[PDB]
């Protein structure tokens, strides 16, 4: 949930992780918390059709402007269609689901554009600082525009994954992180994320 998460975030922040006598952020790491999913790439052509995104497993998905979303698996043929209400259909690029060929061409453009158990995007939204991606499996991912750093948050393991400026991958157990603290920068991203999660529950 976003409540579990919000609880965990409110918590690590309440603790002011960066105003420490000694910040031993190295110790708050945990290689077993690496989330299974995150958005490798995204494309906001939503002024026209919507947001196309690529999961780290290389499956591509587009959440259209009808709130319908087509997801092409990383094998290239399999499809998942989620209607405006959430019904889930499993078709195929070759099986030809009649009426889906316009939609399927729009996905291949997004697929081609980005390359040139599967959790889809529940919803998203940008602010001037970042784009927020809320995945069905519960993780809120926040990609910050300015310095290209990223926060992927999984409420299932109370874990925060932080891809930084140099492009290094680092996963922290939010609460260990609440024992050892972390540098300013990550501590402020968790505050931002906190605000972002509130909102995912507010406007939701």
């Amino acid at each position: 949930h976003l409540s579990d998460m919000l609880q965990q975030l409110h918590s690590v922040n309440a603790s002011k992780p960066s105003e420490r006598g000694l910040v031993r952020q190295e110790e708050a790491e945990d290689p077993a918390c690496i989330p299974i999913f995150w958005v490798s790439k995204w494309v906001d052509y939503s002024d026209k059709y919507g947001l196309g995104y690529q999961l780290c497993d290389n499956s591509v998905g587009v959440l259209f402007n009808d709130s319908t979303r087509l997801i092409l698996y990383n094998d290239g043929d399999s499809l998942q269609y989620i209607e405006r209400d959430g019904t889930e259909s499993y078709l195929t690029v070759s099986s030809h689901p009649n009426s889906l060929m316009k939609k399927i061409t729009l996905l291949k453009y997004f697929r081609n554009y980005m390359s040139e158990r599967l959790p889809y995007l529940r919803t998203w939204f940008r602010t001037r600082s970042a784009i927020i991606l809320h995945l069905s499996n519960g993780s809120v991912q926040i990609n910050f525009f300015q310095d290209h750093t990223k926060l992927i948050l999984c409420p299932l393991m109370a874990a925060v994954t932080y891809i930084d400026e140099k492009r290094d991958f680092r996963t922290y157990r939010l609460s260990l992180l609440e024992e050892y603290g972390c540098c300013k920068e990550l501590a402020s991203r968790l505050r931002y994320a906190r605000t972002m999660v509130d909102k995912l529950l507010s406007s939701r």
Binding site: K41, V43, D44, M114, R126, I131, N143
Partner: peptide, 7 residues
């Protein structure tokens, strides 16, 4: 404006 940054 914008998309992911890849490449």
């Amino acid at each position: 404006l914008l998309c992911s940054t890849p490449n």
